[PDB]
Design a protein around this ligand. Structure first.
Ligand SMILES: CCCCCCCC(=O)OC[C@H](COP(=O)(O)O[C@@H]1[C@H](O)[C@H](O)[C@@H](OP(=O)(O)O)[C@H](OP(=O)(O)O)[C@H]1O)OC(=O)CCCCCCC
Ligand SMILES: CCCCCCCC(=O)OC[C@H](COP(=O)(O)O[C@@H]1[C@H](O)[C@H](O)[C@@H](OP(=O)(O)O)[C@H](OP(=O)(O)O)[C@H]1O)OC(=O)CCCCCCC
Ligand SMILES: CCCCCCCCCCCC(=O)OC[C@H](COP(=O)(O)OCC[N+](C)(C)C)OC(=O)CCCCCCCCCCC
Ligand SMILES: CCCCCCCCCCCC(=O)OC[C@H](COP(=O)(O)OCC[N+](C)(C)C)OC(=O)CCCCCCCCCCC
Ligand SMILES: *[C@@H]1O[C@H](CO)[C@@H](O)[C@H](O)[C@H]1NC(C)=O
Ligand SMILES: *[C@@H]1O[C@H](CO)[C@@H](O)[C@H](O)[C@H]1NC(C)=O
Ligand SMILES: [Cl-]
Lengths: 450, 511
């Protein structure tokens, strides 16, 4: 049973890892791509299985880190600075910050983060995925428009340099099909058909089965082009003309400025905020995560977070061996270059939209947002309807919606590096400003801990 | 009882009239509701598009003896008269697939034997009128007492499956006409139709069909949901199919440079081949003399056509007028059979096609007028079918609005129609129960009082019958499909009691 459980924890680890880094590649001009994230996830999984206190957590790239990497990439492109050396110095500031945390007693702010901030954070991260996949679809339709005629001798060796006949519609079809198949396998896992063991096994592999089906569909279409996953053959870096394997803190093409080394403290404090929040939703493990992320930043490798996983690895000392096996197999996943380069990006974007929509379903803020449109006689048995009036809970949800709108406006500004600051500013809003608007009983009934 | 044998001649017809015609003012004023307008807009497309497709196919199979215009005019006139005079006004009278097979087979016979096709059709219609008057006089329609849920559900499931299969085959044909290629010809002529492969036509057709089906199903689910005010929710859910059609038509309208196949109607109210025939067919030949023997040899094709129309039309009437669908105003079988076959025979005199009651269209029309909430009641009237027939008749003059409707949107609508027509069939429920474990079977008598492997054996015998009927539909002896269906009537009554116990037979088969 252990040999079967390590197969399951592979694919559950594989599907975001091949997705996010691909996103990261398209967000970083392949300077920071699939291979860096895969090898970083492998080495950090090995080290976390060997040295971690709690092996129930798994380490991997997540959405908030991707948003921060895009914010820093836009910051560097606007200021003309080098990106990955700034990442190196942010990492150095992370080592010094976390060793100060160890020198102090610990993180005493764990009680200040409430259900308010976690709901706002998760609803913002789920809203980012849908926006990103729809923006990618719009970009594909802008690259290859629906025209009466096309130039049928375009050159495609670096990238398609002109419009193409059926690429945009096939990308839309692949995205919709992958999302639909993932949602229906998720439905089938909770249905009443088939034997229960076989139904649960099939529904547990909902993402890999949909991925395999859509990859087969695109593979058996011969003439139409669809953009594929950019994966190098071996242990090589994604963009060799951009950076080497080891990245010196001084400079690659231009030396790093004196001012931005000491000013690297300000973005590095926000990395620690983002790692702290999503590890709390899912301090020795925080030490290992931040320290390994800062060490891996020297090699141009991504920071990871702490995420929880289902009880399949609990049924596998045994759970530490399973983590080491899945980490070394994630390392060996880069060796399967042909079957990873035959995967379209539209399949991964359908999976991306599926993960966003699935992540929306467990949030009480989303439940109240749906409760805005229902009549008051259809509101459920939950205590925040029986003990809080409909107008008061609607005002509460409207305030949270206003906060989400403020966060989305700030993320759209050029100064989008201040998103963790504005999002941690909701704790002074909850602990100070909300008791002036609401009463007490409504406040312990709405964002009640559980 | 609506299915009884009285000794007085034309007794079933006069009692059908006496039981349905007092409800005429309620049949007029029961339609004053937005759901009836939504049903009109739904059934108009659902009855116009098969008329266009079958008229084009008929004009291809013959030498334009019977084209799109004749089918549209006949459908409009027969629908108007059947709505104004019928005993079951919720039936939809239109062309069907077996009728096309008979018309091409009879055209092949008349071309081989050198006879005139339309005059032979006229004499077939005369014999049809004679046999339907004789059958209604003898009250022969009571024979449909011998059609139980076995034959009804087998026929309804077969028709729904062929509908879904035909829609998917149309989509696959659209893919085959415009394949996914590396390169295309830029100057493809478009005047009769596209003469070659085109980019973005197959995939956009698939996207339009999928989007229309998805919007129809989501707006169906919104009707039974708990969101929005209840009145607004019911109004939006009632117009779910028109809203889906409008949304995807607007999506196709805002895409400029991509070709999609649009709905096309003939121009003007004229015959398809003015040289071959006029408006009125003379029964004593048109250019040559009509032989006397074929005047008497029309009895066998008239019997075949009467058997076809009788079985589809009466099994449709038993399906729509089931007691589980909460029909209260009453139905009619003798009057409906008399009207359908008599107007078919009269329309054959003008060269117009004869028509029958179609199962999928009539079930869709009744389902679009059923008030949900478990079924409370059905909005039954004579205005929705009359307006659908009138709009089919005026659809030639509706060219600027019908030229903007792509065929893929209607293909998604047809897929939605087939999927919703599967619901309500116990054979489909047992087919679904074949895949569920016995833990999750519902609280129905045929699960509680019947062992689960016996229920599965009953379902498997029905699947064997469906497969045999599908094979008969595939082979060129497709006109024997009703007769093979007749073979399911002794199968319930003779062979099944040898292998099943009596309580299991009244539990699995009921009324
Ligand atoms: C490769 C597999 C091929 C199929 C081989 C299938 C061969 C096969 O064994 O299945 C028989 C199975 C019935 O099995 P059976 O009812 O005896 O066993 C029950 C069943 O497994 C339920 O799913 C369980 O409920 P839950 O979910 O745990 O809550 C229940 O557990 P418990 O709670 O009572 O203790 C079990 O007792 O279902 C079918 O009849 C046809 C399924 C459709 C067959 C699909 C045909 C494609
Ligand atoms: C603005 C605006 O006009 O809405 C006011 C109205 C308030 O609803 P309100 O409670 O006053 O009225 C009840 C509501 O219509 C229920 O849907 C009815 O039940 P059903 O379902 O018919 O059975 C119920 O009838 P009953 O059965 O209890 O006697 C009605 O009493 O609608 C909303 O629900 C707000 C949802 C926000 C709608 C936002 C849409 C943009
Ligand atoms: C539910 C998911 C829906 C996805 C819709 C994607 C829309 C992309 C629009 C790009 C805009 C743009 O900039 O287009 C650029 C070009 C320029 O010329 O415009 C077009 O040629 C417009 C083509 C629009 C096609 C939209 C198809 C919608 C089908 C919906 C099926 C559910
Ligand atoms: C919810 C609704 C879903 C519906 C999906 C239906 C798919 C049917 C596919 C039929 C293909 C076929 O048969 O394609 C046929 C053609 C080749 O035919 P040819 O050589 O021109 O034949 C000419 C024959 N003549 C000469 C008689 C005219 O192949 C292709 O160009 C490749 C089509 C690939 C289809 C993939 C589309 C995406 C499907 C998955 C979406 C999730
Ligand atoms: C990274 O690769 C891209 C191609 O996607 C290239 O345009 C860019 O110049 C590379 N970055 C370098 C060389 O720094
Ligand atoms: C009309 O009839 C003639 C003779 O049967 C035939 O040749 C012709 O194709 C038909 N159709 C048209 C449109 O003329
Ligand atoms: Cl049919």
């Amino acid at each position: 049973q252990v040999l079967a459980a390590v197969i399951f924890i592979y694919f559950a680890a594989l599907s975001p890892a091949i997705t996010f880094g691909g996103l990261l590649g398209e967000k970083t001009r392949n300077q920071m791509g699939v291979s860096e994230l895969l090898i970083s996830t492998a080495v950090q999984g090995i080290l976390f299985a060997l040295l971690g206190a709690q092996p129930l957590l798994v380490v991997g790239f997540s959405g908030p880190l991707l948003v921060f990497e895009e914010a820093f990439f836009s910051f560097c492109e606007t200021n003309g600075l080098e990106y990955i050396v700034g990442r190196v110095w942010i990492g150095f500031w992370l080592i010094l910050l976390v060793v100060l945390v160890v020198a102090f007693e610990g993180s005493f702010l764990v009680r200040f983060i409430s259900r308010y901030t976690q709901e706002i954070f998760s609803f913002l991260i789920s809203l980012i995925f849908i926006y990103e996949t729809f923006s990618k679809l719009i970009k594909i339709f802008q690259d290859h428009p629906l025209q009466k005629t096309y130039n049928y001798n375009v050159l495609m060796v670096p990238k398609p340099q002109g419009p193409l006949p059926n690429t945009a519609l096939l990308s839309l079809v692949l995205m919709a099909g992958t999302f639909f198949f993932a949602m229906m396998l998720r439905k089938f896992k909770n249905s009443s058909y088939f034997p229960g063991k076989l139904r649960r096994v099939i529904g547990d592999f909902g993402v890999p089965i949909s991925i395999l089906i859509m990859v087969l569909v695109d593979f058996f279409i011969q003439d139409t082009y669809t953009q594929k996953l950019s994966v190098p053959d071996g242990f090589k870096v994604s963009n060799s003309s951009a950076r080497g394997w080891v990245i010196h803190p001084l400079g690659l093409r231009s030396e790093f400025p004196i001012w931005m080394m000491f000013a690297s403290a300000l973005p590095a404090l926000l990395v620690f905020i983002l790692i702290f929040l999503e590890s709390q939703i899912t301090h020795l493990d925080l030490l290992l995560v931040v320290g390994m992320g800062g060490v891996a930043a020297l090699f141009g490798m991504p920071w990871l977070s702490a995420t929880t996983v289902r009880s399949v690895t609990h049924a596998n000392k045994e759970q530490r061996i399973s983590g080491l096996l899945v980490a070394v197999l994630v390392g060996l996943s880069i060796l399967m270059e042909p079957i990873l380069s035959r995967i379209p990006l539209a399949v991964l974007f359908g999976i991306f939209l599926y993960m966003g929509v699935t992540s929306l379903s467990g949030i009480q803020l989303f439940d109240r947002i749906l409760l805005l449109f229902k009549p008051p006689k259809y509101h459920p048995d939950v205590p925040y309807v029986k003990r809080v009036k409909t107008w008061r809970m609607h005002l509460f949800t409207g305030i949270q919606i206003i906060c989400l709108a403020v966060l989305w406006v700030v993320k759209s500004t050029p100064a989008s590096l201040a998103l963790p600051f504005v999002l941690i500013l909701t704790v002074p809003l909850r602990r100070v400003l909300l008791p002036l608007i609401f009463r007490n009983v409504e406040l312990q009934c709405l964002d009640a801990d559980d």
